[PDB]
Design a protein around this ligand. Structure first.
Ligand SMILES: Nc1nc2c(ncn2[C@@H]2O[C@H](COP(=O)(O)OP(=O)(O)NP(=O)(O)O)[C@@H](O)[C@H]2O)c(=O)[nH]1
Ligand SMILES: [Mg+2]
Lengths: 164, 5, 311
């Protein structure tokens, strides 16, 4: 069974952990709890084959980012639709990944999380689609860890990207 | 030091 | 901050800040894990390498036991340290009463216990009749592969690689190949039966229900050797695993994992040998006896006392 090393990146508070824990354990983590470095394992079925995912859930701030990128095969870049700053932070991560990999051709997905929180929305879908367009037509989804919208698809889509 | 369980 | 990885038996880990560096205790590590009081109650920190697993005390300083692993190995075993790298794990507390475990409903506690029980099953440490192993196999298929479907599951699906994740390694070669149809049938039945809840924690709990009645469930395992009373020498050396749990004492042949004996608390007595390198078991109610040789003797006897004492 192919192993897939996936990495969840993004600023403080966006739901990297909540998405990962929902996908892997089916539980919704309702509580402020900042990450140092968690690694999860999950077997899944993608495009009709069995895939063993190792998912690195990272701290919202840095010194081991460069090593994660070196090692990772696919990257989920997560911001919160609720917080513009978290969205603005993503450009540099993208660029950083391209630097370490020394290429443009990197499995990636832009994820605007907390889409259950419609009335707190500060980042419009458009800005999200727009940014993905700019990133060489990068994959893009809005998700909610809380309601389970698009949670599996974040990870399945990275697996199909890696399988390209 | 050596007391487990 | 220094940090340490705390692993679970599936190979996942959670990194935890050490507020007092290598003087940080297990209780402090546990406080720094992500866990409610609810989830936490059932589990503690163990130090384990490939062939030696020890449950730590809450006042222990685990980074110092990692640091001292070579002395520990040579005090408790005859293993080659060069082949044993230790890590810290979150695992079931060996003193957890089965009665208390049986009423758990917390989904995170249930998945942690499930992962550990799966790990022991696949390694061969659970002895059970084929029907029970087949039932546990069918539950793992529902848990891991989701709903049964004829186009996908009926033919060429349960090969080696796939059977490996659902049956004990000790049955993979010989016995497992022939179970394929009954596994599938049971799997079909789980999916097709809408009486059976498909919520993850419900299915995991069901797997646990089927493990709770296995006699080695929840055992800490130790290594040792017995000498046969048949003769040649006086007589032949039989390496064994000694399983100690809240139910009693269990001996497994080290090579095949076959269950040699299982004794419930109240049906046997023990005595530590004078040098702490062996212990004797007397099965009153059977009036047989045997002596296990092991540098883990002291540990095994202290654990029997504790788990008998709490029952
Ligand atoms: N309403 C809602 N809340 C969410 C969602 N995802 C996460 N949250 C909430 O937002 C907070 C932050 O979630 P968390 O997953 O810890 O964010 P993070 O990106 O891991 N933070 P860190 O970088 O420090 O480790 C938590 O209270 C969590 O329950 C979501 O989709 N919807
Ligand atoms: Mg987090």
């Amino acid at each position: 069974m192919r192993e897939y090393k996936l990495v969840v990146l993004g600023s403080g508070g966006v739901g990297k952990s909540a998405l990962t824990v929902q996908f892997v354990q089916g539980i919704f983590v309702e509580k402020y709890d900042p990450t140092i470095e968690d690694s999860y394992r999950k077997q899944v079925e993608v495009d009709a084959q069995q895939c063993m995912l190792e998912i690195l859930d990272t701290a919202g701030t840095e010194a081991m980012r460069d090593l994660y990128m070196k090692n990772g095969q696919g990257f989920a870049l997560v911001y919160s639709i609720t917080a513009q700053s978290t969205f603005n932070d993503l450009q540099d991560l993208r660029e950083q990944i391209l630097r370490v990999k020394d290429t443009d051709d990197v499995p990636m997905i832009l994820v605007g999380n907390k889409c259950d929180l419609e009335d707190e929305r500060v980042v419009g879908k458009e800005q999200g689609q727009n940014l993905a367009r700019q990133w060489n037509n990068c994959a893009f989804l809005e998700s909610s860890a809380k309601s389970k919208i698009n949670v599996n698809e974040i990870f399945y889509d990275l697996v199909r990207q890696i399988n390209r | 030091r050596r007391d487990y369980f | 901050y220094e940090k340490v990885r705390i692993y679970r038996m599936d190979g996942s880990y959670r990194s935890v800040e050490l507020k007092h560096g290598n003087n940080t205790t297990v209780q402090q590590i546990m406080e720094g894990m992500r866990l409610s009081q609810e989830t936490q109650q059932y589990f503690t920190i163990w130090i384990c390498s490939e062939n030696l697993s020890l449950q730590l005390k809450p006042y222990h300083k685990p980074l110092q036991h990692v640091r001292d692993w070579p002395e520990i190995l040579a005090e408790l075993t005859n293993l080659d340290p060069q082949r044993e790298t230790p890590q810290l794990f979150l695992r079931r507390d060996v003193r957890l009463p089965l009665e208390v475990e049986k009423q758990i409903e917390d989904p995170l506690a249930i998945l942690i216990l499930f992962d550990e029980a799966r790990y022991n099953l696949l390694k061969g440490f659970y002895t059970a009749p084929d029907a029970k192993l087949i039932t546990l196999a069918s539950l793992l298929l529902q848990i891991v592969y989701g709903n049964y479907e004829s186009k996908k599951h009926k033919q060429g699906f349960l090969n080696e690689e796939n059977l490996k994740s659902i049956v004990p390694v000790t049955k993979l070669k010989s016995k497992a190949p022939h179970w394929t149809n009954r596994i599938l049938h049971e799997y079909k039945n789980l999916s097709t039966s809408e009486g059976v809840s498909k919520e993850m924690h419900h299915l995991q709990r069901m797997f646990l229900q089927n493990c709770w009645e296995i006699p080695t469930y929840g055992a800490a395992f130790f290594t040792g050797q017995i000498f046969t009373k048949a003769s040649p020498s006086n007589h032949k050396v039989i390496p064994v695993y000694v399983g100690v749990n809240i139910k009693g004492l269990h001996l497994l042949n080290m090579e095949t994992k076959a269950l040699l004996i299982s004794l419930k608390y109240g049906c046997f007595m023990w005595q530590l040998g004078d040098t702490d390198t062996c212990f004797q078991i007397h099965s009153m109610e059977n009036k047989m006896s045997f002596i296990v040789h092991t540098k883990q003797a002291g540990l095994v006897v202290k654990l029997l006392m504790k788990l008998n004492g709490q029952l």
